[PDB]
Amino acid sequence: RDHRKIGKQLDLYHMQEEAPGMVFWHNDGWTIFRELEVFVRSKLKEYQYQEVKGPFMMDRVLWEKTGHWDNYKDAMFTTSSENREYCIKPMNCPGHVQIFNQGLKSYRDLPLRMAEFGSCHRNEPSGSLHGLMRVRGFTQDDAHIFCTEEQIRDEVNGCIRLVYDMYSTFGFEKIVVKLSTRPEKRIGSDEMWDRAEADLAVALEENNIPFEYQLGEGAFYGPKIEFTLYDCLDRAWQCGTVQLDFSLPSRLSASYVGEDNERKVPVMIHRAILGSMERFIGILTEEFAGFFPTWLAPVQVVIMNITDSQSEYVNELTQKLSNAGIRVKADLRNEKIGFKIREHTLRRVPYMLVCGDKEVESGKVAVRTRRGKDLGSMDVNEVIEKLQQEIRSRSLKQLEELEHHHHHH
Amino acid sequence: RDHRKIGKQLDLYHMQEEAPGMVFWHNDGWTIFRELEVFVRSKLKEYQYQEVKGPFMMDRVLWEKTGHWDNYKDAMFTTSSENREYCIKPMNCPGHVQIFNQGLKSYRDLPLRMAEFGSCHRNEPSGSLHGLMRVRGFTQDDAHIFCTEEQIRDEVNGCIRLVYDMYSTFGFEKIVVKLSTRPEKRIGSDEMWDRAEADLAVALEENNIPFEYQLGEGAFYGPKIEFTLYDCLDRAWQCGTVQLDFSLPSRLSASYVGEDNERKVPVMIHRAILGSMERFIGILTEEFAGFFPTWLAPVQVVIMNITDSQSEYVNELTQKLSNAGIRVKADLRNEKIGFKIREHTLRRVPYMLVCGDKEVESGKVAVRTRRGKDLGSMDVNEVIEKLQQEIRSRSLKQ
Ligand SMILES: C[C@@H](O)[C@H](N)C(=O)NS(=O)(=O)c1cccc(-c2ccc3c(N)ncnc3c2)c1
Ligand SMILES: C[C@@H](O)[C@H](N)C(=O)NS(=O)(=O)c1cccc(-c2ccc3c(N)ncnc3c2)c1
Ligand SMILES: [Zn+2]
Ligand SMILES: [Zn+2]
Incomplete structure (x- = not known):
């Protein structure tokens, strides 16, 4: 394409x-x-x-x-x-x-x-x-x-x-x-x-x-x-x-x-x-x-809520990731989780952090990728350290991923 | 001026x-x-x-x-x-x-x-x-x-x-x-x-x-x-x-x-x-x-040897400072130390590090400034930390 x-x-x-x-x-x-x-x-x-x-x-x-x-x-x-x-x-x-x-x-x-x-x-x-x-x-x-x-x-x-x-x-x-x-x-x-x-x-x-x-x-x-x-x-x-x-x-x-x-x-x-x-x-x-390596991705992470209930949490996390030097955006819209994920996948955002009620409770995030993969929940600090390492090393490939998208093999 | x-x-x-x-x-x-x-x-x-x-x-x-x-x-x-x-x-x-x-x-x-x-x-x-x-x-x-x-x-x-x-x-x-x-x-x-x-x-x-x-x-x-x-x-x-x-x-x-x-x-x-x-x-x-604050200075540090005895130590410190994010150059020329210092002074390099045998032995550096201030012998990590602090804070003088 x-x-x-x-x-x-x-x-x-x-x-x-x-x-x-x-x-x-x-x-x-x-x-x-x-x-x-x-x-x-x-x-x-x-x-x-x-x-x-x-x-x-x-x-x-x-x-x-x-x-x-x-x-x-x-x-x-x-x-x-x-x-x-x-x-x-x-x-x-x-x-x-x-x-x-x-x-x-x-x-x-x-x-x-x-x-x-x-x-x-x-x-x-x-x-x-x-x-x-x-x-x-x-x-x-x-x-x-x-x-x-x-x-x-x-x-x-x-x-x-x-x-x-x-x-x-x-x-x-x-x-x-x-x-x-x-x-x-x-x-x-x-x-x-x-x-x-x-x-x-x-x-x-x-x-x-x-x-x-x-x-x-x-x-x-x-x-x-x-x-x-x-x-x-x-x-x-x-x-x-x-x-x-x-x-x-x-x-x-x-x-x-x-x-x-x-x-x-x-x-x-x-x-x-x-x-x-x-x-x-x-x-x-x-x-x-368009699947740019994380170091090059215009938006590296999108953090999203399910309902208004998690808006405050998403905002704290966005601020925290931003201070950690990550290019991060919040998606607070009243839309289904699947709808958000599809959109930010078309936007080629490496990581999507889903925040439901349990995430707010445990101080964790549910992690998805733009390749369709579910990486489960992770601690916020863990996600930050792993992203920072991916960025600093200019890594071609994502967490837990074998092969990045590339046309010529 | x-x-x-x-x-x-x-x-x-x-x-x-x-x-x-x-x-x-x-x-x-x-x-x-x-x-x-x-x-x-x-x-x-x-x-x-x-x-x-x-x-x-x-x-x-x-x-x-x-x-x-x-x-x-x-x-x-x-x-x-x-x-x-x-x-x-x-x-x-x-x-x-x-x-x-x-x-x-x-x-x-x-x-x-x-x-x-x-x-x-x-x-x-x-x-x-x-x-x-x-x-x-x-x-x-x-x-x-x-x-x-x-x-x-x-x-x-x-x-x-x-x-x-x-x-x-x-x-x-x-x-x-x-x-x-x-x-x-x-x-x-x-x-x-x-x-x-x-x-x-x-x-x-x-x-x-x-x-x-x-x-x-x-x-x-x-x-x-x-x-x-x-x-x-x-x-x-x-x-x-x-x-x-x-x-x-x-x-x-x-x-x-x-x-x-x-x-x-x-x-x-x-x-x-x-x-x-x-x-x-x-x-x-x-x-x-022309005396730019350290964060703006084109070259922040020059490190000099007195004779080639200290060449290797100077290169080591230069790499160490450069890895610390400091704009640093080694001046290893076969010129008298007082000649090298004057050149970098006139160039308004904020800090000059001089290494003779005593510095090599101790792992320290003799530090002077472009204003003629003599800061004496300083431990290397301390000069690094001080520089990084003054750079990060964009300090007006020091
Ligand atoms: C390498 C340079 O020092 C040399 N002077 C040079 O221009 N060589 S070049 O003409 O072969 C050259 C080098 C790098 C990029 C291009 C180039 C030319 C036209 C472009 C264009 N019209 N659109 C987009 N990229 C372009 C890149 C050309
Ligand atoms: C602020 C801008 O969006 C505005 N469109 C503008 O250009 N305003 S301006 O003309 O007053 C302006 C703003 C900033 C710098 C200059 C200026 C103009 C001429 C220069 C010159 N001839 N040489 C060096 N600096 C210069 C800076 C002008
Ligand atoms: Zn204008
Ligand atoms: Zn050319």
Whole structure:
């Protein structure tokens, strides 16, 4: 089932014609986006990345210098102020290079790993738009690594390791990998492309990763390893990408002082792990058919009463779970228990805590899941500890559950 | 002390002529921005706000409907795709109404408090640009509260209480309040403006806030309370603002079913507490002269060895502090300890931990501060607990 239908069902986002391919993230979809940012940040910390933010627009002159204007013109939105023309950024790399270019850099500063949740706009043909998977405004979990020639192997290897490490959290382990080689419109010499292409192929080989070439699909500035994930119709979507660039730094006058006090141009590795937040959310939505892992679930727990008699109890518990950091909602409606459960199941809420008279008495809760399972009564404190552990460990599967819902086995 | 020189010295941000008023946040400046986002979110959690994200641009037609095109044209950047013109948003409000308009609403949903860290672009004349205080691309800690007429007083009071609550964290001694009334170009009837201006004046007086009128300086859609803060040269900068709007929702066909079954247009309150992150960071930078309180400091601790004898111990402590949630770096360079200390001192790192042989043997650390205070030898868990406490409490000094 399509992520667009599931997105409406869970009130995650919408789009209008007033803004084709521009996403409106509602509260619950934004919750997912934000949790993914937190997850990526935990990895940026561990793998020692800076995190920056570059501006939305820069002078067209800068975009001409990179080769974007010649090779990327059709896709760029432009605007102007006071007789000067600006491009809304389609990529974050040039901004990163401008940051690099502030202050003298030395070999001591390398590898310099510079991440950004970088908002890009690309004027994708309106015929090619597709839900969250192909929009016009999207946010990459981007980074550029500025390094020496001698550091390419280790740094490309690090990016590859990070892809599998992050994808394993979602249960994606058998990943389809491509090496996209020099496109017809490109900058840089043949010799530079032969080297960059060999370097990426050797890294994949060294990591024992099977891949195929994809002829002519590289970026204008360098070849790309692509990590493909599949949607519900098995369409291939580029998500992770690791790219090797011997051209942009030089075009933008990037340099550092080497060990012999000579001026050197840094190599730049580009990579995104999730790809874009929008595309990755669309993929997860379809793969899990909206059964997001508890850490990602917009609403983690719903606590419900049978009658008005338990309203006070449900309210205390909701407050208690909320202070414990759990995303929790009360459902106090005069509706049958089965009716409530069906609704919150369609809403894909991991856990539903049913409070009848006996629950109020014993200070317990009757626990149901969105997979139709009855986990009996549990102590409130026990439920809290078990949920907190499920959240903190970013567990793919629920209490007492063998297999989470996922389309591709 | 000017935030622009401090921002250069502490490697917080830069700007270039290839992008006038367009900020490049470097790692250390972005850390401050991110910490302010965490703080705002924690406050909006208690005050029960949703948090959304609206599109960066929308059809010019939408901005024509709201009155932005006729009353706000010169400030807006525009762009095109496939023969249709788009405005890059200068405000988040119309996007928020669009989200409100998805799904039937009733009185049960109100007050609906909808927050966004909303990136706006405004084509400010280049002669008016000034460091971080007045840029062309900035992010508001914005929100719109959709409510009934009967809820206006409580909701305006709630915004005012939020401003003072959040501002107390930063210790601002001079908060000057203005009430900005109907401008020359506006939407809404004179009667609507009478009511809106009175509601804000009454809210200020009930909250015991002295204020001055700023005649004709209100927004095109409503009057504004402004919470003014002052930079090093005592120049006035609008930061917090609370505005009362009886017009935009109607122009955008917003409605809900009331408790009495009558379908009405919601009132909308616009507010920002910090103002923009950029402007507020410029203010903080001058307010503290770059000596950010620990919770905001880009790097909270640097740990140094005297010689490589203590390298291993320094790495161990660095990992230990980092796991404790502290922003900590190891400085293992082959430089004299007095050279390393001076560098981190000038960088305004709150705490410096020095490890020589005596510290390794004892499992302690020698602690000094960026103000030159020497706290002597401290046990490691005690420094961790103290730091965590001062971070969690967002303490103004220590
Ligand atoms: C990895 C970066 O440093 C590199 N500069 C780059 O942009 N590479 S990319 O063009 O291959 C790339 C990387 C990640 C995401 C996308 C992408 C492109 C278009 C999208 C779209 N139109 N809608 C949704 N997601 C999208 C993601 C592209
Ligand atoms: C509170 C909002 O819902 C309201 N729609 C609004 O934008 N009001 S505002 O125009 O008074 C306002 C509010 C908050 C920040 C700014 C502002 C404007 C320009 C800036 C600039 N040019 N540079 C830096 N910060 C800035 C902040 C303006
Ligand atoms: Zn790039
Ligand atoms: Zn507004």
